[PDB]
From a paper:
Here, we report the deposition of 14 structures of enzymes from both the core and accessory genomes of sequence type 23 (ST23) K1 hypervirulent K. pneumoniae. Targets were selected using a shotgun approach aimed at uncharacterized metabolic proteins from ST23 K1 hypervirulent K. pneumoniae. In silico multilocus sequence typing of all K. pneumoniae isolates was completed using Kleborate. This analysis showed that 64 of the selected proteins are part of the K. pneumoniae core genome, defined as genes present in at least 95% of all strains; the other 132 proteins are part of the K. pneumoniae accessory genome and are overrepresented in the highly virulent hvKp clonal group CG23, which contains ST23 (7).
Of these targets, 34 were successfully purified from large-scale preparations and entered crystallization trials. Fourteen structures were determined for 13 different targets as detailed in Fig. 1.
Author numbering:
A (entry chain B): 1 to 232, 242 to 440
B (entry chain A): 1 to 232, 239 to 440
The structure:
Amino acid sequence: MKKFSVVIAGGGSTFTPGIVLMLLANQDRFPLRSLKFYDNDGARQETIAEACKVILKEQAPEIEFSYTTDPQAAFTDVDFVMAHIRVGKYPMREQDEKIPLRHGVLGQETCGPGGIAYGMRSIGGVLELVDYMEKYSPNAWMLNYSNPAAIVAEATRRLRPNAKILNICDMPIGIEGRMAQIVGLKDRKQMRVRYYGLNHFGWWTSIEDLDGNDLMPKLREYVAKYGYVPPSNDTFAKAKDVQALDPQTMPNTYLKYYLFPDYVVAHSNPERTRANEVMDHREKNVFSACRAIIAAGKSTAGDLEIDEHASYIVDLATAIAFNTQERMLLIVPNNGAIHNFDADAMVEIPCLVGHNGPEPLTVGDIPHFQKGLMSQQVAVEKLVVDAWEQRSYHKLWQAITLSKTVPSASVAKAILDDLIAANKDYWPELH
Amino acid sequence: MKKFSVVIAGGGSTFTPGIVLMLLANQDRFPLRSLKFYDNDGARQETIAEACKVILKEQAPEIEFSYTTDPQAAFTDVDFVMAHIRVGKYPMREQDEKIPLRHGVLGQETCGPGGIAYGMRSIGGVLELVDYMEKYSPNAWMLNYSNPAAIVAEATRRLRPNAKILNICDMPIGIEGRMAQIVGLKDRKQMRVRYYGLNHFGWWTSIEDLDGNDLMPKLREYVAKYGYVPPSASWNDTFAKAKDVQALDPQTMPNTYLKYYLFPDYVVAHSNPERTRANEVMDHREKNVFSACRAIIAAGKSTAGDLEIDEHASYIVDLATAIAFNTQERMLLIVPNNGAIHNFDADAMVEIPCLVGHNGPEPLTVGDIPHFQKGLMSQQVAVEKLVVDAWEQRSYHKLWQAITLSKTVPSASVAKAILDDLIAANKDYWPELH
Ligand SMILES: NC(=O)c1ccc[n+]([C@@H]2O[C@H](COP(=O)([O-])OP(=O)(O)OC[C@H]3O[C@@H](n4cnc5c(N)ncnc54)[C@H](O)[C@@H]3O)[C@@H](O)[C@H]2O)c1
Ligand SMILES: NC(=O)c1ccc[n+]([C@@H]2O[C@H](COP(=O)([O-])OP(=O)(O)OC[C@H]3O[C@@H](n4cnc5c(N)ncnc54)[C@H](O)[C@@H]3O)[C@@H](O)[C@H]2O)c1
Ligand SMILES: [Cl-]
Ligand SMILES: [Cl-]
Ligand SMILES: [Cl-]
Ligand SMILES: [Cl-]
Ligand SMILES: [Cl-]
């Protein structure tokens, strides 16, 4: 019937090609009349964009394509914005990981002080995107799968409460995929689940096949021995220890950072972090492939391939486009879904997705263990956004001090000072 | 593939035959190995059951059939209980309607002091059915479409919080059916809606076709001129009157029962204290169905009675099948609020959209509701909770408070006069009130 207009914010992402490839393999369920790229780093995006221009011309030359650094040109005439930006890129991620480690605190992209720092950089970036979208395409939907979703979602809830923004996380997708393999189902869409939490901080409470057969027993018996490692890395295996605290549920893998922070630090190397691995491998590999493709005018000159994993974004996009009522986990204002939890908290819960966005299902009352953990972590997140809004040093020191990943307020302060000096070019002045 | 065992509580209901004919026409989606009727009025059930037995022998002789007044015989080996009991029957309903009218207050089956009286009689009966079910078939589900659901659901929420009871109402089904004809769709299942309220006291907030097209603009235009009367005497007046009820909040569509709360003066004005709805049903439906059943028995053939399939009732099979086959079908059910309507009492029973599967309902959130509806619902839910307070605590003042608080009642003095009459008339059903 109709073809859609999509703009990818963060066109310079090393995941942009795989995603474009995935979109092309899904023109049957989600056809496009136009595809545009947007980035604030022109030179970086150009390499990714010229390579994709070749791919698109090969598999779908009928699709109108363009890339730019100009918001008006990028956000004009679009139905959807796919946002995957990394304010500060990998050089800043390296700082997020190493600074906490100098003080004996885990350094990670979205958890602990590292995540807090990334969130402080990301809030402004994402608010700008929202403002461009509303100005040039007031009816468009933004599919934000950027990080740290918990902090950024709190900011958009607070400062852009009526903006058509959908915050989604792919971590649960990956864990459900492994759970499916473990119990022997062909994919995660063969399961129906109940879940609650914050982004990167939740639990499955009910896991059944489509017929209603309870899969929890089978998963409990297996996960207790091997974690989320299917019969076919460390994070998935460690889920074994996370799940033992509450035998009746299945935990999100990111909970290892909050329940076993001593372990993460113990297995961390302050000299080489994950950002270093990506910069040494993925960053060069993808750009080298794009350079090769441009030089040849053929995609085959590159080893890029489809990111079937990212198909959940099309699930979301199509749910809205064709009002499918598909059931999926989204980050939404709680407002009674979890009855005994803060109404103004952003929570990750099951929702039906239609053309008007999500219809969250009720969750009910949650127990003291999860409630206590979530209350602590959402306060951290809300303090980070307080610090950004109010340009308050004490609000951020409070946030860091409150984190379960941080042993004391003195260590929290030492880290905060180091973080301030490193993020001078991104954070507002803190008083 | 799997066959179900059902018992109908209220076998002597004039709706039982039409419902049985409905079950028979749906053996494809809901196969039965067994069907049983239960009633506490043997002689009345016997006429209905013996007539239905002739129908089952003609259409489904494989289905095991029996009727009884024995709870053990009735509630043993069942998967579902379909409960449609009317404690006190029509003679008591006549009292519910006429006592308030004698004092210038509307008399109605489930709304106003009549509804309150019927609820006081029903709580005990339903608590008994639930206890029998749990004792003789612990794993069975009760499909309760009896009335007055708002009072009874509040009672079971407090006193049988963990029993497997699904509270459902058929009024929204009928109104949606009419809405569909009005917009021109094939049927109500071609629409997806959002709704909130108490039983017999709610509003549709969103009405779309399955593709998401807005049907509210066309409905507003039509309803503002003719109410819910489709293009195509009692109910016909109520559907037309929705015109006036809907005008208070143009952005929504109301449940027809709201006419009793927003236009109670109108209802009293168009009421006859000497002949009420109960008298109409008694002189028509009660006579006709029993005479038809009596004709089928005497002739030994279904064609001897003018019994028609109750296609409307099919919603009961939608519910039963959703549970039995984990279909995730979306429908309105009466469930504990507990945050679904965020700015409304968590312990209130609310009528809202739910997904229904084998574990029962999964309610959808509603969000915050506006002052108008919140005000009306807070008033009415307090009435309902006061009734159950009166029942539980055996308190006269609690029921006087309940009746006084009703938007159908003008004052505490009128409320007290009505209460004293209802007490005398319900001598054999109500618990004592100190
Ligand atoms: N499937 C995916 O795309 C995927 C996978 C994992 C994580 N993520 C998350 O999505 C985000 C993107 O990470 P990545 O590794 O996919 O991309 P990346 O780190 O390879 O590149 C990020 C791009 O965003 C651009 N950018 C930064 N700030 C911007 C702004 N204000 N406006 C416009 N563009 C801006 C940068 O110039 C850069 O080209 C991260 O937060 C990450 O946690 C996405
Ligand atoms: N059956 C339907 O589809 C339908 C339609 C509209 C309304 N209702 C509602 O359902 C209820 C039944 O109404 P009706 O007109 O269908 O029935 P009815 O008045 O025709 O018959 C009611 C039956 O329930 C029996 N009964 C009363 N108390 C009982 C008890 N404690 N245990 C067992 N049986 C008992 C009576 O003896 C009688 O046989 C009412 O509350 C009514 O508002 C049902
Ligand atoms: Cl707030
Ligand atoms: Cl390599
Ligand atoms: Cl909605
Ligand atoms: Cl600021
Ligand atoms: Cl909807």
